[PDB]
């Protein structure tokens, strides 16, 4: 039938801090699974945070509902985090309106580029 | 629920060779999209292959049907690629039978660790 992404490993300097950051902002939960701090995103995907000393910035873009967009964006502002309309973060403190939707980018504690969008 | 991963950037020394490798083995298509060689995996997810000189190994685990598993595994053997039952590739030329399913690991041309699983 269908190929689906089930797991991906997210490298982190501190896997618990990174998993907690992600779970707090997205309204999800952290589980200790083997050597990972695992965050189940939905009924098909889990992000496995893994302790790593050296790695480059990843880029993850998430489709969310309008309600989820508003809820997550409020948590980012409440947490005192910077965000941008553009992937390079040249345009801070604003969102994009690409494809008749809403979008923005924000870095995780490792410098991974997280992207939220309402229309895919 | 309504958070889904829509895009992720896969770093590659050669984005066209890497996107073609992934598309050939998984039975997918490559599109040129901006500076990416993009592979739509399913209705939800696109892998964006991006030219990069320096990066660390990523890990992506895909859930597939038994039929898809067999079709992909046969392409991997026909292509002359090594695979393993374990994530560290200590046990080559065998698959695992974990979680009431079948699984195996194989590297892409960049050394990204690709995992296939049927689960249940
Ligand atoms: Ca998903
Ligand atoms: Mg998927």
Give me the half-sphere count of Cα atoms (radius 13 Å) on the Cβ side of residue A99.
9
Mutate to test the interface with B, among A8, A41, A69 (most CBs of B within 10 A): A8
Backbone torsions φ then ψ of B12, nearest 5 degrees = -145, 145
DSSP state of A92: B
CB atoms within 10 A of CB A85: 18
Under 8 Å CB-to-CB from B22, ≥6 apart: which residues? B10, B28, B39, B47, B49, B108
Q: Which long-range contacts (C-beta less than 8 Å, at least 24 apart) are formed by B63-66?
A: B63/A3, B63/A4, B63/A5, B63/A6, B63/A44, B63/B117, B63/B118, B63/B119, B64/A2, B64/A3, B64/A4, B64/B116, B64/B117, B64/B118, B65/A1, B65/A2, B65/B118, B66/B102, B66/B118
Q: At residue B51, what are phi and psi to the nearest 5 degrees? A: -65, 130
Q: What was the structure determination method? A: X-ray
What the block records as the tokens of B120 is 């249940």
Closest by CA position to A85, among listed A76, A95, A75, A93: A95
Q: How far apart are CA B110 and CA B10, in angstroms?
A: 10
Q: Following DSSP, what letter does each residue of B75-111 receive, concatenated?
A: HHHHHT---BSSTT--SBT--B--TTS-EEEEE-TT-
d(CA B19, CA B10): 9
Q: Which long-range CB contacts under 8 A does B86-92 form with residues at least 24 apart?
A: B87/B59, B87/B113, B87/B115
Tell me how far apart the alpha carbons of residues A5 and B45 are, in angstroms, rounded to a whole number. 8
Q: Please give the C-alpha separations between residue B97 and each of A4, A6, B69, B120, in angstroms, as whole numbers.
A: 19, 17, 13, 11
For the beta carbon of residue A104, count every other beta carbon within 10 angstroms. Answer: 22
State which residues form the domain around B19: 1-120
Contacts of A62 (CB under 8 A, 6+ apart): A26, A41, A114, A115, A116, A117, B3, B4, B5, B6
Kindly list the protein residues that place their beta carbon closer than 5 angstroms to ligand 1, a single-atom ion: A 45; B 4-5
Cβ count within 10 A of residue B63:
21
As a three-state string, the secondary structure of B10-79 is EEECCHHHHHHHHHHHHCCCCEEECCEEEEECCCCCEEEEEECCCCCCCEEEEECCHHHHHHHHHHHHHH
Tokens encoding B70: 């067999």
Distance B18 CA to ligand 1 centre (A): 22
Resolution of the coordinates, Å: 1.7
Q: Give the span between the Cα atoms of B81 and B79, in whole angstroms.
A: 6
* Distance from C-alpha of B30 to C-alpha of B48, rounded to nearest angstrom: 10
Q: What is the C-alpha separation between B85 and A94, in angstroms, rounded?
A: 47
A40 in Cβ contact with B101 (< 8 Å) = no
* C-alpha pair distances (Å), B66 with each of A2, A43, B13, B101, B104: 10, 20, 32, 9, 13
Token reading at A75: 């948590």
Burial environment of residue A5 by CB neighbours within 10 A (0 to 12, 13 to 18, 19 or more)? buried
Task: Please name the residue of chain B whose CA is at the shortest distance from the CA of residue A72.
Answer: B3
Closest by CA position to B110, among listed B13, B9, B28: B13
- The Cα–Cα gap between A36 and B113 comes to 16
**Total domain count, chain B:** 1
A51 touches chain B (CB under 8 A): no
Provide φ and ψ at A79, rounded to 5°: -75, -10
**Which two tokens mark A53?**
């000393």
In a mutational test of the B interface, the residue from A1, A6, A26, A38 whose CB has the highest number of chain B CBs within 10 Å is: A6
Lookup: tokens for B12: 């590659």
Which uninterrupted H or E stretch holds A13? none
Cβ neighbours for B12, distance < 8 A, ≥ 6 positions apart: B18, B19, B37, B49, B50, B51, B52, B109, B110
Residues 6 or more apart whose CB falls under 8 angstroms from that of A19 comprise A12, A30, A37, A38, A39, A47, A49
Using CA coordinates, name the residue in chain B closest to A66: B2
């Amino acid at each position: 039938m269908t190929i689906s992404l089930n797991h991906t490993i997210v490298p982190a300097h501190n896997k618990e801090a990174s998993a907690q950051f992600f779970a707090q902002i997205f309204g999800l939960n952290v589980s200790s699974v083997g050597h990972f701090a695992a965050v189940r995103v939905n009924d098909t995907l889990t992000l496995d945070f893994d302790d790593r000393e050296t790695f480059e910035s990843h880029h993850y873009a998430f489709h969310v509902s309008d309600e989820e967009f508003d809820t997550i964006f409020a948590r980012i502002k409440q947490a005192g985090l910077e965000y941008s309309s553009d992937p390079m973060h040249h345009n801070k403190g604003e969102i994009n309106h690409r494809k008749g939707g809403r979008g923005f980018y924000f870095y995780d504690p490792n410098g991974h580029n997280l992207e939220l969008l309402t229309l895919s």
